[PDB]
Structure formats: structure tokens, C-alpha cells
UniProtKB/Swiss-Prot annotation, chain A:
Native species: Severe acute respiratory syndrome coronavirus 2
The protein's assembly and partners: Binds to host ACE2. RBD also interacts with the N-linked glycan on 'Asn-90' of ACE2. Cleavage of S generates a polybasic C-terminal sequence on S1 that binds to host Neuropilin-1 (NRP1) and Neuropilin-2 (NRP2) receptors. Interacts with host integrin alpha-5/beta-1 (ITGA5:ITGB1) and with ACE2 in complex with integrin alpha-5/beta-1 (ITGA5:ITGB1). May interact via cytoplasmic c-terminus with M protein. May interact (via N-terminus) with host bilirubin and biliverdin, thereby preventing antibody binding to the SARS-CoV-2 spike NTD via an allosteric mechanism.
Protein name per the record: Spike protein S1
Outcome following mutation: residue 44 to F: In strain: B.1.1.298
Consequence of substituting residue 37 to S: In strain: Omicron/BA.1, Omicron/BA.2.75, Omicron/XBB.1.5, Omicron/EG.5.1
Shown residues within the full chain: 410 to 458 of 1273
Taxonomic lineage of the native organism: Viruses, Riboviria, Orthornavirae, Pisuviricota, Pisoniviricetes
Outcome after substituting residue 44 to F: Decreased HLA binding to NF9 epitope. Increased binding affinity to human ACE2
Mutagenesis or variant effect for residue 8 to N: In strain: Beta/B.1.351, Omicron/BA.1, Omicron/BA.2, Omicron/BA.2.12.1, Omicron/BA.2.75, Omicron/BA.4, Omicron/BA.5, Omicron/BQ.1.1, Omicron/XBB.1.5, Omicron/EG.5.1; May enhance affinity to human ACE2 receptor
Function of the protein: Attaches the virion to the cell membrane by interacting with host receptor, initiating the infection. The major receptor is host ACE2. When S2/S2' has been cleaved, binding to the receptor triggers direct fusion at the cell membrane. When S2/S2' has not been cleaved, binding to the receptor results in internalization of the virus by endocytosis using host TFRC and GRM2 and leading to fusion of the virion membrane with the host endosomal membrane. Alternatively, may use NRP1/NRP2 and integrin as entry receptors.
Phenotypic consequence of residue 35 to T: In strain: Omicron/BQ.1.1
Phenotypic consequence of residue 43 to R: Increased resistance to neutralizing antibodies. Decreases HLA binding to NF9 epitope. Increased binding affinity to human ACE2
Region (Immunodominant HLA epitope recognized by the CD8+): 39-47
Amino acid sequence: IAPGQTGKIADYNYKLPDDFTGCVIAWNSNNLDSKVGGNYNYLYRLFRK
Amino acid sequence: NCVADYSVLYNSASFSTFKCYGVCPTKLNDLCFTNVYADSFVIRGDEVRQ
């Protein structure tokens, strides 16, 4: 998640402009979103044409 | 003496790192070389930076 970066998310689900003005804020959520049996309600696009 | 396809290796998520110097990975399909050599060995994780 940065300008100039590539990958399955950078190309398929969240691309930033390379002239992006702003801030990338992140924190772990291991004690809220993860669940035993796994949390399968969060989907990402694995493949796109 | 073969046809190389670097998109398979690039899209695969199994790799911990895929860093290209001098080139970049989506241009590799329209480029070709007289030879490519693969230097293969095992290192410690913290030594990848070296």
C-alpha cells in the first residue's frame, strides 16, 4: 500500500497514484478481526484479467 | 535455447521476495537475452538483505 508498488492487491484491489499526497496509517487487528476457525468474511480479488 | 515466461514466477505468491535490479518484472516478457544464469543456494532469512 504505497505509490509505485505492485502486487495482487496493488494491481487488483487497491492501486494508489504515483503522485499520491497523504498518509498511510496502519495497526494490527489480531485481537478483533481474526477468529478461531478463521475469519472468512474478508475477501480479496485473487485474479483479474 | 528456450522460451521463458517470467509472469508465472512473478504472479506466484509463494515467494518471500522478488526484487529486480536494472529491470522490472512486467517488462520481462517483451525483452530477451543471449543467456540467463540462475545462481542457486540456501541462506539464513536475516541474510537475504545481503
